[PDB]
Amino acid sequence: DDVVGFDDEAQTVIDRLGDLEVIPVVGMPGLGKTTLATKIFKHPKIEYETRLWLYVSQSRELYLNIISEKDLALKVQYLIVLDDVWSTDAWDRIKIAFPGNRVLLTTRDHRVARRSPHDLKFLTDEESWILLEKRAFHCKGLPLAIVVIAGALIGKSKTIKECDKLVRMSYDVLPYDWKACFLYFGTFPRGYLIPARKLIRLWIAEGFISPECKAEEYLNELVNRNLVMVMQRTVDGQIKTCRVHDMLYEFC
Numbered sequence: 638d639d640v641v642g643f644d645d646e647a648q649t650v651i652d653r654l655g656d657l658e659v660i661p662v663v664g665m666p667g668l669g670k671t672t673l674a675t676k677i678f679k680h681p682k683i684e685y686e687t688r689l690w691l692y693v694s695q696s697r698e699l700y701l702n703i704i705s706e707k708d709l710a711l712k713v714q715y716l717i718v719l720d721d722v723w724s725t726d727a728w729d730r731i732k733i734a735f736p737g738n739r740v741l742l743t744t745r746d747h748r749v750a751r752r753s754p755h756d757l758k759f760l761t762d763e764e765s766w767i768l769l770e771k772r773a774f775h776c777k778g779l780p781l782a783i784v785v786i787a788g789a790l791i792g793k794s795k796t797i798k799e800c801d802k803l804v805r806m807s808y809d810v811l812p813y814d815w816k817a818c819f820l821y822f823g824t825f826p827r828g829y830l831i832p833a834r835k836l837i838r839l840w841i842a843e844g845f846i847s848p849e850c851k852a853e854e855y856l857n858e859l860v861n862r863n864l865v866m867v868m869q870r871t872v873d874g875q876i877k878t879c880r881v882h883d884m885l886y887e888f889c
């Protein structure tokens with residue numbers, strides 16, 4: 638629950654939630670579409686809608702994850718979130734899954750206009766100050782830009798720094814041992830969900846070096862530097878599934 642400025646923005650999409658609606662959330666990458674959907678998915682809706690997350694991307698086999706296309710269209714038979722849809726043809730074939738039920742949609746494409754698209758707002762100058770203050774201590778409205786800005790120097794003046802170059806600005810302050818592990822996310826598909834334990838054994842074999850213990854600390858710091866997003870946690874090993882943002886992936 639570390640989200641700012643989306644209290645009034647989520648309610649607007651909640652009032653949107655007459656048998657099956659689309660509800661598309663349009664916005665440039667890094668604006669907070671996945672973050673807003675998480676706030677909406679976990680908003681007090683126990684008495685309203687069940688509730689499962691289905692992450693797709695630019696990549697039919699995701700039907701079975703809770704419990705041959707004919708078998709994939711019969712046993713699928715509420716509110717379910719679609720994380721990232723890239724084209725109209727991707728939704729025009731997956732929609733025949735399970736027809737007061739709704740489906741939440743977030744995407745970066747305005748061409749996916751299916752029924753008025755709710756364009757996500759930008760953080761104001763005051764709400765951006767709150768996000769930067771809490772993400773550094775604990776610029777133009779883009780939350781990803783505010784997130785990438787990692788305070789490596791805590792001096793009396795930080796005016797020396799007043800989206801690729803912002804990633805480079807946090808990339809230049811990374812130690813040499815962390816650069817090879819951060820760029821290794823380019824060897825995986827765009828938006829790939831990498832298991833943390835598997836990624837650690839891959840870093841050891843690649844020569845990025847007890848070794849499995851400090852490799853987690855390399856992953857913890859990259860998350861602390863706000864460069865790697867943790868998707869799933871647990872109680873046996875904490876960080877379970879992680880991924881890198883699509884804008885940070887273009888840099889890798």
Ligand SMILES: Nc1ncnc2c1ncn2[C@@H]1O[C@H](COP(=O)(O)OP(=O)(O)O)[C@@H](O)[C@H]1O
Binds near residue numbers: 639641666672780781
């Ligand atoms: N309202 C917000 N408050 C705090 N952090 C945010 C907010 N919106 C986005 N972020 C941060 O930006 C990063 C990437 O945003 P993301 O949800 O991927 O946007 P999109 O879904 O539009 O690509 C996330 O790690 C998240 O922490």
